[PDB]
Amino acid sequence: MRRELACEGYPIELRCPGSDVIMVENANYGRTDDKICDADPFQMENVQCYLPDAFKIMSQRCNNRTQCVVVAGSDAFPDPCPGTYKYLEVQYDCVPYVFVCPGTLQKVLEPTSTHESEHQSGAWCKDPLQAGDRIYVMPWIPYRTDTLTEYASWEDYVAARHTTTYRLPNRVDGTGFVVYDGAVFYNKERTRNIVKYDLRTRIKSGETVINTANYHDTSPYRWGGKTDIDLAVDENGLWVIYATEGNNGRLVVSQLNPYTLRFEGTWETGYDKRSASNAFMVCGVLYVLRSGNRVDYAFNTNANREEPVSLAFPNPYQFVSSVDYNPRDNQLYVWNNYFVVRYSLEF
Ligand SMILES: *[C@@H]1O[C@H](CO)[C@@H](O)[C@H](O)[C@H]1NC(C)=O
Numbered sequence: 001m002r003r004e005l006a007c008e009g010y011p012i013e014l015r016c017p018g019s020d021v022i023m024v025e026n027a028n029y030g031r032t033d034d035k036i037c038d039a040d041p042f043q044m045e046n047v048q049c050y051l052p053d054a055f056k057i058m059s060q061r062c063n064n065r066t067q068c069v070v071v072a073g074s075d076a077f078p079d080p081c082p083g084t085y086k087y088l089e090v091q092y093d094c095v096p097y098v099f100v101c102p103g104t105l106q107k108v109l110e111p112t113s114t115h116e117s118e119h120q121s122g123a124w125c126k127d128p129l130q131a132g133d134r135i136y137v138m139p140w141i142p143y144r145t146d147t148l149t150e151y152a153s154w155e156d157y158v159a160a161r162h163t164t165t166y167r168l169p170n171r172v173d174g175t176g177f178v179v180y181d182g183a184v185f186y187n188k189e190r191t192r193n194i195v196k197y198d199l200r201t202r203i204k205s206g207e208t209v210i211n212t213a214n215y216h217d218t219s220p221y222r223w224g225g226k227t228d229i230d231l232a233v234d235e236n237g238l239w240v241i242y243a244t245e246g247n248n249g250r251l252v253v254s255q256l257n258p259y260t261l262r263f264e265g266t267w268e269t270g271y272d273k274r275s276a277s278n279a280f281m282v283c284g285v286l287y288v289l290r291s292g293n294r295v296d297y298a299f300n301t302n303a304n305r306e307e308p309v310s311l312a313f314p315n316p317y318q319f320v321s322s323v324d325y326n327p328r329d330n331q332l333y334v335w336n337n338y339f340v341v342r343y344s345l346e347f
């Protein structure tokens with residue numbers, strides 16, 4: 001994380017790479033060390049001067065912005081130690097697009113519907129970190145799934161006008177995969193491991209074996225078809241939805257770091273995967289499809305408590321391939337029985 005300093009009276013400016021925005025993670029206005037901002041050795045003596053309130057002052061002015069004009073003076077900041085020279089030490093990070101929870105899910109709408117695709121099963125998702133209409137379409141074919149196609153826009157996909165073709169080094173084992181910061185997260189065929197293939201660099205950059213998780217048609221969805229592992233991205237981050245022997249057939253949702261490829265916890269839900277249609281994450285809350293085509297189960301990982309909220313979902317066809325949520329547009333990317341569809345939501 002980036003760090004910048006400015007003495008008492010001198011302004012501080014936090015710059016972000018081009019389109020990115022400031023995110024304050026640590027801040028203090030005072031003195032921690034004597035050697036910094038030389039003025040008077042008598043004034044430099046107090047090395048225990050702190051102002052914890054400096055966080056909110058910086059966060060209110062710098063966040064959701066590329067740059068911020070903040071002056072480390074007595075006018076904007078309160079003096080914590082009178083008769084001591086001060087400096088502002090700020091530890092921050094730049095984000096391409098920051099995301100916050102829009103609200104609570106109620107009824108799923110029906111707008112934006114695409115044509116009858118070439119294949120019955122597959123998955124499609126937009127990059128939540130990249131601003132634009134870049135569509136990553138991955139058609140699923142049994143025992144030979146291996147290529148992702150790129151499309152410039154909704155108009156570009158319906159007209160069969162593709163931008164590029166990506167030949168993955170491993171075969172895909174399931175439909176509902178996910179694209180995060182130009183990197184594809186997919187399950188390897190005949191294995192419990194997930195591969196991170198960065199399309200940006202066009203080279204493999206990580207692989208993590210998911211322990212106790214049932215792989216390759218062992219524990220897929222109601223229709224089957226190698227969907228043992230279904231990746232989803234929400235407002236919180238990256239999630240890996242699967243089923244273990246430890247939970248006994250039930251869904252095991254776990255948070256995974258997109259860059260370190262390490263786990264940030266493991267949760268247990270009370271809903272069968274063999275009865276489930278397709279699971280996706282929204283604001284850290286799980287939602288499991290049932291196909292009587294509606295979502296009945298929901299589990300809050302942040303609260304570690306479930307809620308059986310039987311809420312309406314648009315009934316498409318008897319064959320549902322993949323249902324994944326995109327937190328950027330707050331829409332549902334659904335591939336089911338050839339037909340590919342977007343869906344707006346109630347908040
Ligand atoms: C990329 O590499 C593959 C395999 O070596 C080759 O078939 C393909 O033509 C290359 N793409 C181009 C046109 O650069």
Ligand SMILES: [Ca+2]
Binds near residue numbers: 279280322323324
């Ligand atoms: Ca899903």
